[PDB]
Amino acid sequence: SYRIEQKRNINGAFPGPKSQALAERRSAVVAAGVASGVPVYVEDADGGIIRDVDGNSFIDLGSGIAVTSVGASDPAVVAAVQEAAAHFTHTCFMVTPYEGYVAVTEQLNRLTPGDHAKRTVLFNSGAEAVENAVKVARLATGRDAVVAFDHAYHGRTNLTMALTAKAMPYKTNFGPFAPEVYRMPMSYPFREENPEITGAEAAKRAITMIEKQIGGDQVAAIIIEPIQGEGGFIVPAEGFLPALSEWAKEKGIVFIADEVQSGFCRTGEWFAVDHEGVVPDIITMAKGIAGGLPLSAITGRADLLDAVHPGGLGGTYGGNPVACAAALAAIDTMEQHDLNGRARHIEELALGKLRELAAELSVVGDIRGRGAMLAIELVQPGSKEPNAELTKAVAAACLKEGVIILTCGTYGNVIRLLPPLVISDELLIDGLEVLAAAIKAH
Amino acid sequence: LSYRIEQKRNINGAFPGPKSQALAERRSAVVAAGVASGVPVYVEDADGGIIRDVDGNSFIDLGSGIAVTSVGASDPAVVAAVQEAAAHFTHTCFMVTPYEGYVAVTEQLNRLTPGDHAKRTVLFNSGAEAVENAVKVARLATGRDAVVAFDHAYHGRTNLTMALTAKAMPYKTNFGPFAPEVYRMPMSYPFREENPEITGAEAAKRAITMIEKQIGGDQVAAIIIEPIQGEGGFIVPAEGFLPALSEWAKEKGIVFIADEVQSGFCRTGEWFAVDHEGVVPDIITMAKGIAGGLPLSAITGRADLLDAVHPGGLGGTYGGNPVACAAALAAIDTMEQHDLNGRARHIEELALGKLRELAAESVVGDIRGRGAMLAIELVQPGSKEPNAELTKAVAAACLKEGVIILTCGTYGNVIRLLPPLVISDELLIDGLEVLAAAIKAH
Amino acid sequence: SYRIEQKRNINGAFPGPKSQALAERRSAVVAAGVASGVPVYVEDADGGIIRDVDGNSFIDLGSGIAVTSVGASDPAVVAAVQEAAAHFTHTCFMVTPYEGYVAVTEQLNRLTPGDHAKRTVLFNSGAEAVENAVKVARLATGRDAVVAFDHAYHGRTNLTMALTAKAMPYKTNFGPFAPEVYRMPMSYPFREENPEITGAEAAKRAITMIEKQIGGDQVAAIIIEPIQGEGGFIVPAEGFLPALSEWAKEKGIVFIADEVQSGFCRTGEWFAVDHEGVVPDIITMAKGIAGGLPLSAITGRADLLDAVHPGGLGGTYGGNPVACAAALAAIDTMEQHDLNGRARHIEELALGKLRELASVVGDIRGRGAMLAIELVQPGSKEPNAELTKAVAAACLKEGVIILTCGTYGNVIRLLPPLVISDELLIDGLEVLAAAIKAH
Amino acid sequence: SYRIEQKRNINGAFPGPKSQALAERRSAVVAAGVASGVPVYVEDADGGIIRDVDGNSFIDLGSGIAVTSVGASDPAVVAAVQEAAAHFTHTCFMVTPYEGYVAVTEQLNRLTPGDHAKRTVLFNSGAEAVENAVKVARLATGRDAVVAFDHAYHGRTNLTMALTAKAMPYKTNFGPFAPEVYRMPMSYPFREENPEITGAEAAKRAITMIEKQIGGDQVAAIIIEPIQGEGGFIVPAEGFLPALSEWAKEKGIVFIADEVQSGFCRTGEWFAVDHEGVVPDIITMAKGIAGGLPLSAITGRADLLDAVHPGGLGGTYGGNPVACAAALAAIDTMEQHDLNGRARHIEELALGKLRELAAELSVVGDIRGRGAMLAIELVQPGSKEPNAELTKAVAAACLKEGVIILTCGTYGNVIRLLPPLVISDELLIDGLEVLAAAIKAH
Ligand SMILES: *Cc1c(COP(=O)(O)O)cnc(C)c1O
Ligand SMILES: *Cc1c(COP(=O)(O)O)cnc(C)c1O
Ligand SMILES: *Cc1c(COP(=O)(O)O)cnc(C)c1O
Ligand SMILES: *Cc1c(COP(=O)(O)O)cnc(C)c1O
């Protein structure tokens, strides 16, 4: 059940007058480099719809980059936020604590993988979460080196930029970057030089390289996204992640799962790592956790997190009570409405339609992902060469028909589906039809 | 002025009470042990100058969540704005689908920050993100690497902001290695200058020569300084220091960054601490008080600098969250409607009056600050040696009587007053009386 | 014509009494970690022979890690050093200059690739050369990033460690390392995941990765050894080095050829890059340059090197006059006796015998007097470090000092002095062949 | 007893024809930035004379920046080099070892301070020596941070540049620099803001700062020159350090004495540290060690150096046998001719003449140093402001009269005397007379 009409409706040209008026105001005061993928301005966002200030209704297939999984205005989230703000907006947990922080903390302990003792700390952004996961690995192990992977993305702070692989736009001219970060090869099936390579073998390749170029006993942490987001929704070959996990344990290296984008039901399991039963030492969370409010978290082994000295990890706003209220409600919605199930259903529907399209066409190089985190990598006809032009064009074409869809990828040639999990089959199918028509059209 | 909950200090028997204890017991199973709180009671409602715990005790709030809830922890306007905004949409990510709130907050910061030159703004979540982004801009726009920070600086808990931060315990220990090309220079700290007669101008010349000799003016991307150093101990530089640095920075093409995360938005009796001396920073970093307790941060600076950054270079998922933006617009509005600059100046007159009365009856080394950002540095009797023991003891003694007061300082020996600006004279005086009694008692 | 008898001769067991006496002294005073590959102590070294203090004569197939290419006591070098030391040992070129520095500088300008305007600065070690090449690239381009490759080795200072790939023993526990160094995939034919990959294709793989992970316009320098030394005498596929060079020029990136080990006739050309006609923007030199004396150099484009401010590049000892005298003589010997030719001849002989030896032999590669055999496990490509250690020991036992190397510790390398006789080289190769068969 | 006539003798204008011919050759082939302080080219250098290719004889008051302490062609050194080179030039100690290395190693063990177990490794340059000291400290302690001081100079590699304080010309545009280097205040009596400050107090200032900004238990090494060379022959106040040494021992910090310039009799003791009886954990050596040949060394505690793994420390050329021969002879000369005594005698003579000059004048700010490492810091008349113009001019004036004298200093205003220790009283006095005349003249 939804608040605004759940269907695609574009009345004439856009941006309309009220959107244009905002754009004109914007350019006087927001940095020129801060661009938006969409030229219309939101007034209301709900279910699978973004409704602009000129009354146009777009299908939302991005969920704010995997954030509003429960929907951009889930009643429970809205109510919780409204109620919490009336009591106190902020007291800073490090100064005067409050139940909401503890309570979110309890849920994450429960929902994250593994049955060992775990603890949590809360912050605001994904980047802060990753920063803190690395702080903990480094202090707990007494080591320096952190290994990250090709096609990784972990944020826009200096260290998270360091950890991030792609330079444009995330890194160019922003260095020099945090030291002792090393990059290793990813398991990226569609582009392996030897297509027959196994997950285990891909892991062994990474492991040998780490051992030879750093040494296992010198690495504080291995950080990897179980499904690489901005890198192009790269899913590693079966057996890769477990091999890295096993080896990390052998060598006393903290294995950090970055589930900022893949976490909270997005992939059809609570965490992406659940697909293969990998149990990370620390896991970083944000985006979907708090139904749109700014919250992030690390949850990991008690012995690691409890190693940090008093006052070592923190922040002013972190674990904001209004955001915490949002999170508790968001997680509750995830359970009450079985969003894991909705995500699995979305996979079945969307991959169905996409494979139909593959069978008609060829520009469709690879279809991959899980749950509500799906992607199609577009290539040049009859080869594997990347096709960024087609990708840019298809996104624009979709936008023209009233479908907001996101792109990504190291080579700028991956269309990604990140719909809110509460999206109706009707709307999703409509969106997928527009997408399929766009690809055919170009 | 008028409030929601009774504005009186009221402690019913021993605390933490039962409901607080229950929360502490829950907390220790799930929150990392290093995340400590200064206060053992759990908030239920925070309003005006009072923190009311879950067991019905009412403490005087002389910390405002570390300078965050300047307008109060539940300002009706803020609360209303948050409630209203959340009902429309919690998040769409400005970089994907933009929205008025972002632009509007951006318009206000342009207007309220110093200088009449062309300015632009980008929004993020935390103070650390803000400082990170200022440095990104300075580095890209100047084409240089080096950033100078000062003794007693504090700028955050990410890797770079830790690098910029001076004090190692607890902010840095075992969390490195730290981001490169950060250089540290001597601060103007009157009370501890080896030559007590030194002038602000002379202190600036000392810093400038050192920068020139050890980096070179044309090699420095940015000088970053807090006009009043917060965690460092509410250090106010001698008159003439900040302008000298500013003038020189302009000479050498160096971006002068004012970190006003803690001192900004009326805290000091002016909109920004730099306004006391009429310094006009090239970029200024903001958070804490900006959004009445919601998680928001900002950089506002010269258009030519910020606009230099390439499309997509600066950003974040949550940044400039719409619910937070609503909160900021309301918070800023309250600051104007109720003349919080005036309230801050009044707080100064009152608080410095009572503190100087106490000095006049020695363990009180220095009284300093301005507006609602005031401090007393405690020393050993009859010398200038730091007295952390007395500082810890006074904070504890205050808490016991129902007054939550914060401490700070490089040497752990500074009591700081950061009351909310909406505090009543009655409550402030009560708090100051408790403070004065506590110092005398120990 | 040689000074000491050019015959392999081991009298009984070693280390002998005088060597043992030195080892006993050594352990009281030299750091324990500083180990030597050979347990005997040199008294005289000449031609292809190392003669120890107990009168044993070993065949020298390492030339001090590619240093004594002209021989460990070339008469010309010896005479020049003796003469120069009598006038002055040192005045520091940055204070009071002298002809020797300028002269060495003239020769390097002449002998290095390319006809464009070039300039030179001198230092002491290979690591100092590389450090200075990077300083110049960074200042001239105004950029930060430097790319190095898998299997690279460039030295033991903090930055050169950073540039170096292998952690044991060069890096472990010695960091944190100099920032803004990025590592890219090498063209290593024998271990390519796709054995059919081309040099051009391997270069494209590296280039795309650089572009995507740094950006061409952000890179101050690409640094590569034309033949990777300590990494295992890895020779890249034809077309790789020129592609990188072309691209570097396109993007304003300084292309640094690290020829510290491969330079000065070692590969049968003056510089390894000459095999493919690549013309580096800066080239780093040491080892062979001064016939054993401590000297190093960078030689590169005038417009790059001249960009550095007065006093920016230097050092106290750098371009030492005694070492310069040695270099001029060494280079002279290289020409007078056509050591390039001797090197090409050593290749023909050595590669001949090594190919006859062919299973435990994975790959035979190299050029001139810089040759190698990579040993694997029988019937696979898995590395065989055990066999490699054992063969080196077996050769030592028979009076042949031979060096090993490689990322996986499984490469036997031939680095004989270029003045070695065919008789001695064949003898050494026979001992090597016998040792491999033996294990 | 000497080889060439020990008298100052300039025949007409210079550079003469043969020098000019070399300059013309030079400019075609040496980088333009590589400048020389002296426009004439050496043919022979012996005793206290540099004789150029046009037959002019200059007094040498620089000894090649403190290198040719035994003289630029000491017969013993010359003979030893000649003999050694005939046997073998190089075999690489790590491959085939040799007596010369071991022997030099024995002497350094014997001559360095302390009676504890010591070990040595050899390299080529001073920078390599410092690099290796730091490698050992870092591995042996398991820590990262290295503290260096204001006015320090340690070399021109990336890390030694990092350690070095002054940017022009050593650092400008050559970064980014090696991470985890921290800079602390030096004891520099002449420029202390509080002139009455004590060495012990100065050390306490540095120590507190280290403790507060890094933490004692986080520092791998403290590296300091007992007399700072290029920084301006700064001698710390008595008691400085010993206090640093005592504290380093308490905190498990490796204390590195950089004696590359001050070592081997230069100050009138074998090492500058011997003046105050400080016993460093590692000591770095080069310059004077091998009478002009390229050699350097670290000598330190067995337990520290032996901690390094096999193959960890090394180099190709390091401990070159011809250089080793030189060193043994050079050390032998130092003993046979009591160069410590000669240095002490030089001090008495030179400081005598310099203080006479101070009495006549005022432009002479400070006279300091020990042994044959002496300096006069020149200031503006009647103040402490630096006088780089006078300094440049005096050096030029001296050169004109046939005296080659070096300058140095953070502020470019220090004339330094680094004569070879084998210089005759007659020549030294002549040189000092020219110097005194030059200062008076300008
Ligand atoms: C979005 C993202 C981040 C950074 O999160 P922010 O909240 O934008 O700081 C980090 N890691 C991954 C894997 C992400 O997808
Ligand atoms: C609190 C503080 C910061 C960091 O802000 P967070 O939001 O706590 O990351 C930065 N700068 C100053 C001056 C501060 O007081
Ligand atoms: C040996 C080596 C160096 C280091 O030279 P040193 O003089 O030992 O510092 C640098 N680069 C390469 C390619 C080498 O083989
Ligand atoms: C000259 C100097 C060095 C550097 O030695 P080089 O051989 O020139 O690398 C190091 N330390 C000190 C104290 C010096 O004066």
Written overview of the protein:
Four copies of one chain form a homotetramer. Chain A has 442 residues and is an alpha/beta fold. Chain A folds into two domains: 177 residues, Aspartate Aminotransferase, domain 1, CATH 3.90.1150; 265 residues, Aspartate Aminotransferase, domain 2 (3-Layer(aba) Sandwich). In chain A, 36% of the residues lie in helices and 16% in strands. In chain A, the strands form three sheets. Chain A has a seven-stranded mixed sheet, sandwiched between helices. In chain A, helix 4 packs parallel to helix 10 and helix 7 runs parallel beside helix 8. Chain A starts with 16 loop residues before the first helix and ends with a helix. Chains in contact: A-B, A-C, A-D, B-C, B-D, C-D. One pyridoxal-5'-phosphate (PLP) sits at the interface of chains D and C. One pyridoxal-5'-phosphate sits at the interface of chains D and C.
